[PDB]
Design an enzyme around this catalytic site. Sequence first.
Site, mmCIF file in Angstrom:
data_model
loop_
_atom_site.group_PDB
_atom_site.id
_atom_site.type_symbol
_atom_site.label_atom_id
_atom_site.label_comp_id
_atom_site.label_asym_id
_atom_site.label_seq_id
_atom_site.Cartn_x
_atom_site.Cartn_y
_atom_site.Cartn_z
ATOM 1 N N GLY A 1 -22.927 7.879 -44.374
ATOM 2 C CA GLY A 1 -21.966 7.302 -43.609
ATOM 3 C C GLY A 1 -22.497 6.816 -42.031
ATOM 4 O O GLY A 1 -21.785 6.597 -41.140
ATOM 5 N N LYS B 1 -34.533 7.886 -42.221
ATOM 6 C CA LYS B 1 -33.990 6.806 -41.310
ATOM 7 C C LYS B 1 -35.001 5.549 -41.343
ATOM 8 O O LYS B 1 -36.066 5.701 -41.031
ATOM 9 C CB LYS B 1 -33.650 7.094 -39.818
ATOM 10 C CG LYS B 1 -33.184 5.995 -39.402
ATOM 11 C CD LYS B 1 -32.465 6.351 -37.964
ATOM 12 C CE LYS B 1 -31.546 5.573 -37.272
ATOM 13 N NZ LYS B 1 -31.058 5.942 -35.794
ATOM 14 N N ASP C 1 -26.635 7.145 -25.470
ATOM 15 C CA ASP C 1 -25.799 6.859 -26.599
ATOM 16 C C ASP C 1 -25.126 8.298 -27.328
ATOM 17 O O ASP C 1 -25.175 8.345 -28.456
ATOM 18 C CB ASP C 1 -26.589 6.163 -27.610
ATOM 19 C CG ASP C 1 -25.763 5.346 -28.773
ATOM 20 O OD1 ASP C 1 -24.448 5.203 -28.363
ATOM 21 O OD2 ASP C 1 -26.063 4.908 -29.755
ATOM 22 N N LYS D 1 -25.294 0.144 -41.481
ATOM 23 C CA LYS D 1 -26.020 -0.717 -42.421
ATOM 24 C C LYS D 1 -27.132 -1.357 -42.006
ATOM 25 O O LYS D 1 -27.882 -1.486 -42.894
ATOM 26 C CB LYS D 1 -24.775 -1.764 -43.100
ATOM 27 C CG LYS D 1 -24.420 -2.740 -41.958
ATOM 28 C CD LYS D 1 -23.484 -3.990 -42.238
ATOM 29 C CE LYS D 1 -24.217 -5.101 -43.079
ATOM 30 N NZ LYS D 1 -23.346 -5.813 -43.886
ATOM 31 N N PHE D 2 -27.501 -1.268 -40.790
ATOM 32 C CA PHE D 2 -28.726 -1.904 -40.200
ATOM 33 C C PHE D 2 -29.815 -0.975 -39.928
ATOM 34 O O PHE D 2 -31.064 -1.480 -39.803
ATOM 35 C CB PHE D 2 -28.162 -2.765 -38.954
ATOM 36 C CG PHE D 2 -27.309 -3.788 -39.234
ATOM 37 C CD1 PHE D 2 -27.763 -5.106 -39.998
ATOM 38 C CD2 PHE D 2 -26.113 -3.833 -38.882
ATOM 39 C CE1 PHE D 2 -27.002 -5.986 -40.249
ATOM 40 C CE2 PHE D 2 -25.239 -4.999 -39.206
ATOM 41 C CZ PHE D 2 -25.565 -6.216 -39.967
ATOM 42 N N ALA D 3 -29.525 0.343 -40.025
ATOM 43 C CA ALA D 3 -30.636 1.352 -40.009
ATOM 44 C C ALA D 3 -30.060 2.595 -40.647
ATOM 45 O O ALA D 3 -29.391 3.569 -40.303
ATOM 46 C CB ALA D 3 -30.669 2.131 -38.427
ATOM 47 N N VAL D 4 -30.499 2.368 -42.096
ATOM 48 C CA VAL D 4 -29.892 3.185 -43.233
ATOM 49 C C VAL D 4 -30.559 4.609 -42.771
ATOM 50 O O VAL D 4 -31.469 4.740 -42.703
ATOM 51 C CB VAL D 4 -30.137 2.444 -44.566
ATOM 52 C CG1 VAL D 4 -29.842 3.367 -45.542
ATOM 53 C CG2 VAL D 4 -29.876 1.140 -44.517
HETATM 54 C C1 LIG Z 1 -20.708 12.830 -45.314
HETATM 55 S S1 LIG Z 1 -21.455 14.470 -44.978
HETATM 56 C C2 LIG Z 1 -23.064 14.208 -44.067
HETATM 57 C C3 LIG Z 1 -23.759 15.323 -44.101
HETATM 58 C C4 LIG Z 1 -24.920 15.046 -43.093
HETATM 59 C C5 LIG Z 1 -25.165 13.842 -42.786
HETATM 60 C C6 LIG Z 1 -26.618 13.841 -41.924
HETATM 61 C C7 LIG Z 1 -27.545 14.495 -41.670
HETATM 62 C C8 LIG Z 1 -28.609 13.824 -40.946
HETATM 63 N N1 LIG Z 1 -29.873 14.541 -40.528
HETATM 64 C C9 LIG Z 1 -30.596 14.070 -39.619
HETATM 65 N N2 LIG Z 1 -30.340 12.673 -39.156
HETATM 66 C C10 LIG Z 1 -29.157 12.146 -39.593
HETATM 67 S S2 LIG Z 1 -28.574 10.753 -38.729
HETATM 68 C C11 LIG Z 1 -30.059 10.313 -37.852
HETATM 69 C C12 LIG Z 1 -29.964 8.975 -37.076
HETATM 70 O O1 LIG Z 1 -28.854 8.188 -37.369
HETATM 71 O O2 LIG Z 1 -30.662 8.482 -36.223
HETATM 72 C C13 LIG Z 1 -28.403 12.583 -40.298
HETATM 73 S S3 LIG Z 1 -26.500 12.262 -40.962
HETATM 74 C C14 LIG Z 1 -24.354 12.707 -42.700
HETATM 75 C C15 LIG Z 1 -23.074 13.172 -43.283
#
Ligand SMILES: CSc1ccc(-c2cc3ncnc(SCC(=O)O)c3s2)cc1
Length: 284
Positions: free
Chosen positions: A24, A46, A142, A27-30
């Site tokens: 979730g 990432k 942010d 779309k630009f940094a998957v």
């Molecule tokens: C829909 S259930 C769900 C469970 C876990 C996670 C995520 C786990 C996780 N662990 C590390 N990094 C990220 S996002 C890192 C970033 O966006 O820079 C993420 S997003 C996202 C959604």
Amino acid sequence: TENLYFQSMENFNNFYILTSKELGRGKFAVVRQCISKSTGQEYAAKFLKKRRRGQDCRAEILHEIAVLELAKSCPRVINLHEVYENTSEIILILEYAAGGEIFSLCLPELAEMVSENDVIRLIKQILEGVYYLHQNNIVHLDLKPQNILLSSIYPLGDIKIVDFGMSRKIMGTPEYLAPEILNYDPITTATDMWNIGIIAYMLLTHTSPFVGEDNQETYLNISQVNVDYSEETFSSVSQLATDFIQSLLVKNPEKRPTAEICLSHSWLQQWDFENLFHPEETSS
Ligand SMILES: CSc1ccc(-c2cc3ncnc(SCC(=O)O)c3s2)cc1
């Protein structure tokens, strides 16, 4: 003509397998879940595009990696495990925060299982992380609730701050912008403290403090600091919580307390009932 710096994509695919899980994110940094083939351990991958909006971003990505590396010793900040690179992407292999976003606990959709005691603990952990960042002259810039993750939700785990894409030394989502950002005043650690104010408000009320019918109204709400503190919205919120939020959601960034001062707020002072308290009047 561009030479690659980080470990090869061939090594990525040799060592990891991507899962089908939908995280979730943008779309630009998957961001995808992946699993070490050797150990079975889950990670987040990432995929940062090196070319964005017609601009070379590799230097900026390198800076972001430098910031995560500096925060390795802070367990409130998502850990960086490995780095890979291919023609168009630099891939960060991050600690996986299996609880997902703290945003999920802020929803109207949720009829809630989040106690003030839990909110107190989460805010304290957020403050610990931000204190660590500010002490190292990093401002995140942010700290929306979508960028504060949880190690689990069943039971409720620990905070992991993510996405240092905007971080600086001493154009976000409109409702999360501090008034100083709207006036182009310079970047201050106080901007992050404003966002902690928003997080606390959203955890406790399940409502956005500044968002309006449109962006114009959102900007009006922020620059005037027009916040709903009505009895209805706050009938189940303690005065001490109210004080904490109100000390942060102030227009003038210099009047906001530091992360350090916040950590001493009376709201956050709590004794674990299972520990034996040692009072001031001693037995001798
Ligand atoms: C829909 S259930 C769900 C469970 C876990 C996670 C995520 C786990 C996780 N662990 C590390 N990094 C990220 S996002 C890192 C970033 O966006 O820079 C993420 S997003 C996202 C959604």
